[PDB]
Design a protein around this ligand. Structure first.
Ligand SMILES: Nc1ncnc2c1ncn2[C@@H]1O[C@H](COP(=O)(O)OP(=O)(O)OP(=O)(O)O)[C@@H](O)[C@H]1O
Ligand SMILES: Nc1ncnc2c1ncn2[C@@H]1O[C@H](COP(=O)(O)OP(=O)(O)OP(=O)(O)O)[C@@H](O)[C@H]1O
Ligand SMILES: Nc1ncnc2c1ncn2[C@@H]1O[C@H](COP(=O)(O)OP(=O)(O)O)[C@@H](O)[C@H]1O
Ligand SMILES: [Mg+2]
Ligand SMILES: [Mg+2]
Ligand SMILES: [Mg+2]
Lengths: 467, 480, 275, 91
């Protein structure tokens, strides 16, 4: 439509000058004279017919005076029912060496959040087969879920266990978006999805689509992948009536990548070096992943905490965008309890008697009270010792130490490097097993018998063998 | 009477950055040459001037000097003529043996391969240390981290690893040979000289390349070094060969990059580090992979090293790096002081991919040892408990080695077999070492055929098991 | 401004977003005005009932007062205000007009689905007939979140000057200061402590001073306030909380350890006060 | 040996401007018209034939315009076997 000239190149920020026809904000531009396609996005209007842009690829080899062409619309990607079983990238180009993607229509990345009158307020429960989540902080259908944890504590093993347990039996479609992670894990996921049968290469019976931008990409790309996943997630919700599952890995890299360019744009840093616009641009992205009167979306997101700190500005503003929280701890993982879920720091919105029933709620509140009481005796035990306690305190210590063991469980996806067998518990058995321990029926068993088992019946047999 | 399309004049020099007037056809990230022999890199292209980063001392550049273009992005000499040579961060020889006869060049900054060209790790990478090859195996195409405090024994592991490969490299099969590359950042020259003498004495400088950027060198030279070695390693990977690279210290590179950033007046953050430290290592450690058959079948393995203060593993850089590699080895200082050497904490060390690539015999003899060690740890804090402790102490005594002495796989298999069968539950814990030494000597000097069989077959057959039992019981009876 | 806004959901500038239709109003009022001085006031003498046993017996609240609710996340701050709003039905369904109270709820920084569930919870107990909801969610621009509380205080002041009584609630005052900090930094003003502007105290001091009890020469109306604050890991000696502690007349403390020991609502009676 | 002029004095930092030539970094300069020696060491090349230096002694009583001299090399000191049993300062 119109042509410009490059005036300055610094890192991942480029400025262009237009003689006539100044493009509007959020439009895409094309660079002339390169082997591979390179696209720029307009961000600011400076003045004197100049704009400041952000690149989506490497910017080595650019010379002042080079030509830039205008397109006239934002970034558009192919969307439809033929994206199932394929692999895309930031700007919607196939990277699975299988030819072009022949869809009928396209869609733009940037849109607006659903209005106030389109919200739904129904609530139900989702069963995962994991004791801690079902007993303490159950999930829901059409809600947001977050997994907090440090480095090396096990977020992605839990995400793969949830995929294995829930995704297979689902009747709808699924979307997996990977942002700022390892490439070899993506290759492993692709090959195991080929083996299982979710991806079929000889017909049209696939039920998953993949979008990837990993940690080897410049910061411009990593700041835009999640919206590329969101668009293909939203098409299946609006145009078709379907239930969609969306998995996002380390949405924290969406925030970090945005602060690597804030300095180059000429802004004053706010706190701990972060950009001043940290909550608004997160709120813009998060409000689109919702459930409306046309469909449902269930979200599972993994979040990262720098230097094992929960007061950092990045993970401290995500608590307000969730309906269920699961917090992982390194100290529990040191003691050998897997999964390392903190039972005194996880919440859910549907833990009330009128939804889950009275019995479940009473059992959960009793186990939480018992767990809280044992934590307040640590200082005395750590110095004076166990002998100073009375009988009731010793009894509470023994029961709390027995309860802690029974919360661990073996996973099926970890059988390869643990030498065990996976287990899957129904809800009623967990409720009854915790009731029986609370009632004191198993005070004559050693505390080492409640370690890494499934239903309660396996504890008595392992205790019987370990005479 | 001067052109300003391929020539420039310095307008200011200081704080590392030099601003040049002219050069109107220069490219982003293009090498430029000064009038004193130094070389620089174009970083900031601005409407009025260009910012250049000098790769050297700044007392040799004066205002008014003339700068000229070269016409290429930063690249380094690559090839197989570099084997046996000590070079600097740009490829200039510093060993005084003559010039390098290279014929090919490659860029320092290139993106890593993607999802399709990759495949899983299948082939083993032998070290020579019993604890590593038995409890934390490593495969070809994997990233493993060596973390610990100062003066714990981090470099010795790499030095021992390099020496062991001579066995395969001196053979005939061309699918078991491995080349090695060592990068030194922020060290002292004397240590490097002694290291190369040590390597020369064991005939290991015939398949090794050394890159050095010591403390006296400027920061940009200590910032460019790892990528230069990475490209030289990548040469082999794309031509159907195997290689190994060892980054001595990434913390000093992080410190140098922080120094460079602050003088450019960029907003500091946590611990005054810039916000792009993660990308700096994320790019580098993603270029080691295992190619598939259609692309050639090569490999590249990496072993970064990081130092901690008072065993704080919850800091910024140590946690950043852990979220990149595929496993870690922990070295403690208390074990080093009490005597256990190498001082490896078995509880924390882990490997995610090495388990698949492991010889059957070693797996057969290692699993039981792992379980027994776990039980001994759990009971350390009746007859059965005493039995557990008695087994544990001897098993701990077995996993100790000296220095500059790698071992072959079969000898480790036999030694571990002896312990796991419980044949050494009578000797006092102070006599384990002498028995191990004498037994190994006897076996090497007297049979050699069972060793050859175990090596060729790759599995401990029943007949072999019976013969092993015979040999061990006979020698133990004659031990006296 | 007016009483045609009862039963409606409006944005920060007085636009309907509930889909009913246009609002028929006859009056307008500025958002930035001065609080009453010393002469037009009188002492506080009448009770404001909530329905919480642990509040009405140990921490009583009068009409014309300011009281702070402060605690960590997931402790129960919202449900106190929700219970307080519902309780007023038994008085509004009566005869005399000297014991009626109107309610205003302001949401700053929250997501839309939570507000939808709150409105549904209110409408199934027959309480929307005397409430006004003003919302500026997390997807709105920073100036709207910065302007929302004053726009609701100006609506509350209408009842105060005509002999009627009203109640107002500012949910998460901590999320207005972040929008003010974002708006000020982009205007190239120098930062301060934690990059907050130099006068964050004056942002809330001119807001919480507008609640007062008027004497008989001016009508006898009143206006009550209940701000909300959130603390990080139970740290009450931070920057923002200490500013707002020294402005109000009292505070109610909520704790997690009491929450997990079966004490719900988790009110710490050893520290909560009412001046 | 070119001569310059002082153009700014702020604490212990002095700026000198040269009409022709320019001393390289880490060079020593001599200030004229004082009862005791006063050496300066070059640190940067600001531009417009002006350099920024640091002072090795007290800086008071200087005037904007005093002449300066260039030694041609960094600080030099006596070295030999007659330095045994003596005391010397930095210069
Ligand atoms: N297995 C061993 N047996 C005996 N001595 C050993 C052994 N391993 C290491 N050492 C000794 O430990 C010392 C430290 O060696 P090394 O240089 O490997 O440690 P480091 O922790 O990498 O040191 P630095 O932090 O100074 O680089 C040396 O004196 C070395 O001889
Ligand atoms: N008296 C009570 N009895 C039982 N459950 C209660 C009680 N009060 C509050 N809760 C529960 O406590 C949880 C948190 O309550 P609430 O929504 O008021 O928290 P909050 O302080 O507003 O949290 P946030 O910071 O997320 O906004 C809810 O699950 C609610 O049902
Ligand atoms: N359920 C589990 N059982 C056994 N080991 C586990 C489990 N979860 C995590 N781990 C340990 O954690 C490591 C993997 O961590 P990872 O899931 O990659 O952490 P993150 O998700 O934070 O990157 C494995 O090597 C394993 O030893
Ligand atoms: Mg992970
Ligand atoms: Mg070392
Ligand atoms: Mg709330």
């Amino acid at each position: 439509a119109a042509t410009g000239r490059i005036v300055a190149v610094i890192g991942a920020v480029v400025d262009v000058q237009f003689d006539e026809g100044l493009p509007p904000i959020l439009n895409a531009l094309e660079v002339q004279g390169r082997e591979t396609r390179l696209v720029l996005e307009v961000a600011q209007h400076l003045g004197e017919s100049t704009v400041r842009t952000i690149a989506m690829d490497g910017t080595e080899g650019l010379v002042r005076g080079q030509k830039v062409l205008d397109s006239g619309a934002p970034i558009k990607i192919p969307v439809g029912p033929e994206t199932l079983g394929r692999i895309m990238n930031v700007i919607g180009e196939p990277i699975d060496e299988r030819g072009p993607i022949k869809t009928k229509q396209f869609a733009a990345i940037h849109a607006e959040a659903p209005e106030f009158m389109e919200m739904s307020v129904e609530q139900e429960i989702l069963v995962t087969g994991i004791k801690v989540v079902d007993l303490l902080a159950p999930y829901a259908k059409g809600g947001k879920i977050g997994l907090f944890g440090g480095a090396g504590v096990g977020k992605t093993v839990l995400i793969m266990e949830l995929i294995n347990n829930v995704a297979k039996a689902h009747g709808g479609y699924s979307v997996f978006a990977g942002v700022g992670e390892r490439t070899r894990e993506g290759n492993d996921l692709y090959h195991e999805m080929i083996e299982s049968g979710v991806i079929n290469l000889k017909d049209a019976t696939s039920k998953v689509a993949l979008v990837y931008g990993q940690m080897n990409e410049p910061p411009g790309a990593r700041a835009r992948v999640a919206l590329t996943g969101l668009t293909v997630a939203e098409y299946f919700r609006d145009q078709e009536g379907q239930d969609v599952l969306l998995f996002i890995d380390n949405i924290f890299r969406f925030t970090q990548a945005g602060s690597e360019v804030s300095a180059l744009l000429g802004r004053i840093p706010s706190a701990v070096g972060y950009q001043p616009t940290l909550a608004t641009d997160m709120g813009t992205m998060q409000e689109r992943i919702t459930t409306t009167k046309k469909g449902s979306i269930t979200s599972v997101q993994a979040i990262y905490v720098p230097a094992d700190d929960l007061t950092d500005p990045a993970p401290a503003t995500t608590f307000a965008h969730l309906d269920a929280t699961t917090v992982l701890s390194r100290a529990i993982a040191e003691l050998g309890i897997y999964p390392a879920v903190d039972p005194l720091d996880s919440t859910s919105r549907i833990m009330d008697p009128n939804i889950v029933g009275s019995e479940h709620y009473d059992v959960a509140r009793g186990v939480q009270k018992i767990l809280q009481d044992y934590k307040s005796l640590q200082d005395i035990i750590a110095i004076l010792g166990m002998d100073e306690l009375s009988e009731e305190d010793k009894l509470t210590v023994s029961r709390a130490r027995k309860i802690q063991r029974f919360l661990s469980q073996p996973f099926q996806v970890a059988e390869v490097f643990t030498g065990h067998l996976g287990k899957l518990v129904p809800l009623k058995e967990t409720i009854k097993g915790f009731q029986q321990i609370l009632a004191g029926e198993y005070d004559h068993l050693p505390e080492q018998a409640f370690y890494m088992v499934g239903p309660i019946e396996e504890a008595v047999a392992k205790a019987d063998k370990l005479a | 009477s001067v052109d300003l399309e391929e020539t420039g004049r310095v307008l200011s020099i200081g704080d590392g950055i030099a601003r040049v007037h002219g050069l109107r056809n220069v490219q982003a990230e293009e090498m430029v040459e000064f009038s004193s022999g130094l070389k620089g890199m174009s970083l900031n292209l601005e409407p009025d001037n260009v910012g250049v980063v000098v790769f050297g001392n700044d007392k040799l550049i004066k205002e008014g000097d003339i700068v000229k273009r070269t016409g290429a992005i930063v690249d380094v000499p690559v090839g197989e003529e570099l084997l046996g040579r000590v070079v600097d961060a740009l490829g200039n020889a510093i060993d005084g043996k003559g010039p390098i006869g290279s014929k090919t060049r490659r860029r320092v900054g290139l993106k890593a391969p993607g999802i399709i060209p990759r495949i899983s790790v299948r082939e083993p990478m032998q070290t020579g240390i019993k604890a590593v090859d038995s409890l934390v195996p490593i495969g070809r195409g994997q990233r493993e981290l060596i973390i610990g405090d100062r003066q714990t024994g981090k470099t010795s592991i790499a030095i021992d690893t390099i020496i062991n490969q001579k066995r395969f490299n001196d053979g005939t099969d061309e699918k078991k040979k491995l080349y090695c590359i060592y990068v030194a950042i922020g060290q002292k020259r004397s240590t490097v000289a002694q290291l190369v003498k040590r390597l020369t004495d064991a005939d290991a400088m015939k398949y090794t390349i050394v890159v050095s950027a010591t403390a006296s060198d400027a920061a940009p030279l200590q910032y460019l070094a790892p990528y230069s070695g990475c490209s030289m390693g990548e040469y082999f990977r794309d031509n159907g060969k195997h290689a190994l690279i060892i980054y001595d210290d990434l913390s000093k590179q992080a410190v140098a990059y922080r120094q460079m950033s602050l003088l450019l007046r960029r907003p500091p953050g946590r611990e005054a580090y810039p916000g792009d430290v993660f990308y700096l290592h994320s790019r580098l450690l993603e270029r080691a992979a295992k190619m598939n058959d259609a692309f050639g079948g090569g490999s590249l393995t990496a072993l970064p090293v990081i130092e901690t203060q008072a065993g704080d593993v919850s800091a910024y850089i140590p946690t950043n790096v852990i979220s990149i590699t595929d496993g870690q080895i922990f070295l403690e200082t208390e074990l080093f002081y009490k005597g256990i050497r190498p001082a490896i904490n078995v509880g924390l060390s882990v490997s995610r991919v090495g388990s698949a690539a492991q010889t059957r015999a070693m797996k057969q003899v290692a699993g039981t040892m792992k379980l027994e060690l776990a039980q001994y740890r759990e009971v350390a804090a009746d007859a059965a408990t005493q039995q557990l402790l008695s087994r544990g102490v001897r098993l701990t005594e077995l996993l100790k080695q000296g220095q500059y002495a790698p071992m072959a796989i079969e000898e480790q298999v036999a030694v571990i077999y002896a312990g796991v069968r419980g044949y050494l539950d009578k000797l006092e814990p102070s006599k384990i070492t002498k028995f191990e030494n004498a037994f190994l000597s006897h076996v090497i000097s007297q049979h050699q055929a069972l060793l050859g069989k175990i090596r060729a077959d790759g599995k401990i057959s029943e007949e072999t098991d019976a013969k092993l039992k015979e040999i061990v019981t006979n020698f133990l009876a004659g031990f006296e």
